[PDB]
Amino acid sequence: HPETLVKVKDAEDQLGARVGYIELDLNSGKILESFRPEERFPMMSTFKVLLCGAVLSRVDAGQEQLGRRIHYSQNDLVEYSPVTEKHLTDGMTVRELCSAAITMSDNTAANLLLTTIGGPKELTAFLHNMGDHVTRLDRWEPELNEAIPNDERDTTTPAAMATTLRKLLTGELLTLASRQQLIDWMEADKVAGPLLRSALPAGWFIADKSGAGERGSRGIIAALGPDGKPSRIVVIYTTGSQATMDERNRQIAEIGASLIKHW
């Protein structure tokens, strides 16, 4: 809706930074609104949904099992590892590592999972092979959040990310069981409370994944809809602002309110 694009423009001007935006009909696959759709933005932790998409594709092929237990070391623990720091002794299953990476945005969980698929280059190869030749992961946690201006490492475009998420969630790539698992992890997101969720009316469905990084980088990807059923994908990114986390949160929530208002 035109009003939602105004909010996005509002946000650009108030944050002093680029904002990228896509609304995508999940059923028809039609793009409903777009803003800077072909511009690059750091993915930050939003890449963790793609990562577990790659992991689930390996589970489908039998190259990975959700119950496989991975043990690791104190040395493996990087900044912000709220779940993995608790399981040095017992290890964690692949299933638990994806849950930690997606619902809590656990950084060591994401690095361990990246190791299982062969690293950033292999995540990018996975995306390439499902028809996303735009998104690229180059680095590990936490360096992938560096968001150096004009640095294309670890970036996506709002359009690439929106269509890739649609394919992972509703397309032919993953089995029905793996699609449902991916969206189930996203629905159980615990670290995106002040964002789209804050504008979400009672009874609406949302499955999402947020991200934040250096140099004002902030974003979210989501499938949402009324009546407890997703019907739309929404992608919002920003980078470059000197604004506080709180202000960037409110801008995203404000864009959310307009999207919901004009559904």
Apex 217 CA angle, 211 and 221, nearest 5: 35
Single-letter amino acid, residue 50: L
Residue 91 tokens read as 């290890």
CB of 1 to ligand XE, least distance (A): 13
Q: Which residues pair with 19 in a beta bridge?
A: 238
d(CA 40, CA 219) in angstroms, rounded, equals 12
Residue 45 among the catalytic residues:
yes
d(CA 186, CA 181) in angstroms, rounded, equals 9
Which is closer to ligand XE, CB of 112 or CB of 253? 253
Q: Which of 3, 38, 85, 143 is catalytic?
A: 143
Which is closer to ligand XE, CB of 55 or CB of 196? 196
Given the structure tokens 């489908």, which residue do they identify?
A: 60
Q: Which of 12, 23, 45, 178 is catalytic?
A: 45
The annotation status of 211 as a binding-site residue, yes or no, is: yes
The annotation status of 171 as a binding-site residue, yes or no, is: no
Give the residues lining the site for ligand XE (CB under 6 A).
11, 19, 26, 169-170, 183, 196, 199-200, 223-224, 230, 236, 238, 251-252, 256, 259-260
- The residue sitting closest to ligand XE, measured at its beta carbon, is 256
CB of 216 to ligand XE, least distance (A): 10
CB of 102 to ligand XE, least distance (A): 14
Q: What is the edge-to-edge ordering of all strands in the sheet holding 205-212?
A: 31-35, 18-25, 232-239, 218-225, 205-212
The annotation status of 16 as a binding-site residue, yes or no, is: no
Which is closer to ligand XE, CB of 104 or CB of 224? 224
Residue 3 among the catalytic residues:
no
User: Which residue blocks in the chain are alpha helix, DSSP H?
Assistant: 2-15, 47-61, 94-103, 107-117, 120-129, 158-170, 176-187, 245-261
CB of 162 to ligand XE, least distance (A): 12
- Catalytic (active-site) positions: 45, 143
